[PDB]
Design an enzyme around this catalytic site. Structure first.
Site, mmCIF file in Angstrom:
data_model
loop_
_atom_site.group_PDB
_atom_site.id
_atom_site.type_symbol
_atom_site.label_atom_id
_atom_site.label_comp_id
_atom_site.label_asym_id
_atom_site.label_seq_id
_atom_site.Cartn_x
_atom_site.Cartn_y
_atom_site.Cartn_z
ATOM 1 N N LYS A 179 3.059 6.587 4.880
ATOM 2 C CA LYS A 179 2.140 5.561 4.414
ATOM 3 C C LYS A 179 2.612 4.194 4.890
ATOM 4 O O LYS A 179 3.817 3.921 4.923
ATOM 5 C CB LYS A 179 2.030 5.567 2.892
ATOM 6 C CG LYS A 179 1.100 4.504 2.340
ATOM 7 C CD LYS A 179 -0.334 4.999 2.211
ATOM 8 C CE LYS A 179 -1.304 3.865 2.416
ATOM 9 N NZ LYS A 179 -1.101 3.236 3.753
ATOM 10 N N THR A 180 1.659 3.338 5.255
ATOM 11 C CA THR A 180 1.945 1.974 5.670
ATOM 12 C C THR A 180 1.784 1.033 4.489
ATOM 13 O O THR A 180 1.216 1.380 3.451
ATOM 14 C CB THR A 180 1.011 1.514 6.786
ATOM 15 O OG1 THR A 180 -0.332 1.921 6.479
ATOM 16 C CG2 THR A 180 1.437 2.122 8.105
ATOM 17 N N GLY A 181 2.280 -0.185 4.679
ATOM 18 C CA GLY A 181 2.081 -1.281 3.755
ATOM 19 C C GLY A 181 2.194 -2.590 4.509
ATOM 20 O O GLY A 181 3.041 -2.720 5.399
ATOM 21 N N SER A 186 0.800 -1.222 0.000
ATOM 22 C CA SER A 186 0.000 0.000 0.000
ATOM 23 C C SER A 186 0.831 1.270 0.000
ATOM 24 O O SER A 186 0.252 2.357 -0.120
ATOM 25 C CB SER A 186 -0.982 0.030 1.180
ATOM 26 O OG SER A 186 -1.776 -1.147 1.206
#
Length: 234
Positions: A184-186, A46
Site C-alpha cells: 500500500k502507498t501513502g 493511506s
C-alpha cells in the site's frame, strides 16, 4: 539467495532523505537503513487503509472486497476518485472518501477498541473518526509498520483468517512470473509511504519504504531495491 543483512541501498536514498526496512520472513533477519527515521512516528496517510479494511470487514461495516459505495458527484483531485468504488478498488487508488465513509460506519468506539488490540502506533483517533490518519493525531513508526505488516502476512492478528486473506489479496500490485508484489502507498506533505511484502519461490519478505517524496516515489524506490537483489524480475 539474498542475505538481507549484507544490504546497501544508499544509492537509492540519495537526493531524498528516507528509510528502508526489509525483513526476511524465513531467515528472520531485519535490515534497516536510517534506523533513526524508522523509529519515529508519523501520519500513516493511506497505509492506514490496510488496518481500516481489516476492521471494516471484521465488524461487518462492509461486506467483501467488492462492497460498492456510489460516488456522490463531488469532483475531487484525481479522476480515478470520481466514480463508483468498492473496498478493493478504493484501496488500489487510495480513494480516501470510501475509507472515510467506512470509518464513520466503524465508529469511534470500535475503532479505538481495535486499534488498541492490534497495537497500531499511538492509537490516537482524537483527530476525528474520519480524519485521525490523515495528517492528524494518529502516528506510527515505519518499524511499527513493518511489524504490523509482518503480523498480517503471518496472520498473527486477531482478525478472521479469510478476512486477512481478503485484505492481502487487495494489496496485490504485480503478479509476475516469479514473484507477487503486495503493498500500500501513502502520500502527502512531501512524505511517501510504501508498505507491503513480496513472495518468490521459497522466499517472502516484508518491506517498508519511507521517504521525502511521494508514495509513487516510495514504491518506485522499493521495486528498485527489490530488483537490485533479484527479488523482482518478470
Amino acid at each position: 539467495s539474498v542475505n538481507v543483512s549484507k544490504l546497501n541501498v544508499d544509492e537509492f536514498f540519495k537526493d531524498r532523505d528516507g528509510t528502508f526496512i526489509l525483513h526476511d520472513v524465513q531467515k528472520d533477519k531485519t535490515f534497516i537503513y536510517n534506523e533513526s527515521r524508522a523509529k519515529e512516528r508519523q501520519t500513516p496517510q493511506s497505509t492506514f487503509k490496510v488496518p481500516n479494511a481489516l476492521i471494516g470487514l471484521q465488524v461487518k461495516a462492509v461486506r467483501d472486497e467488492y462492497d460498492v459505495k456510489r460516488w456522490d458527484g463531488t469532483e475531487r483531485e484525481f479522476e480515478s476518485w470520481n466514480r463508483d468504488h468498492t473496498l478493493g478498488s478504493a484501496m488500489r487508488d487510495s480513494v480516501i472518501w470510501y475509507y472515510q465513509a467506512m470509518a464513520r460506519d466503524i465508529g469511534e468506539d470500535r475503532m479505538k477498541d481495535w486499534l488498541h488490540r492490534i497495537s497500531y502506533g499511538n492509537e490516537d483517533i482524537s483527530g476525528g473518526i474520519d480524519q485521525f490518519w490523515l495528517q492528524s493525531s494518529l502516528k506510527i513508526s515505519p518499524l511499527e509498520e513493518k511489524d504490523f505488516i509482518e503480523h498480517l502476512y503471518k496472520e498473527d492478528l486477531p482478525f478472521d483468517k479469510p478476512i486477512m486473506k481478503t485484505v492481502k489479496r487487495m494489496m496485490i500490485q504485480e503478479e509476475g512470473d516469479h514473484y507477487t508484489l503486495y503493498g500500500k502507498t501513502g502520500t502527502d506533505y512531501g512524505l511517501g509511504w510504501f508498505v507491503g511484502f513480496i513472495t518468490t519461490d521459497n522466499h517472502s519478505y516484508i518491506f517498508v519504504t519511507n521517504v521525502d517524496a511521494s508514495g509513487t516515489a516510495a514504491k518506485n524506490i522499493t521495486t528498485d531495491i527489490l530488483k537490485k537483489y533479484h527479488l523482482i524480475t518478470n
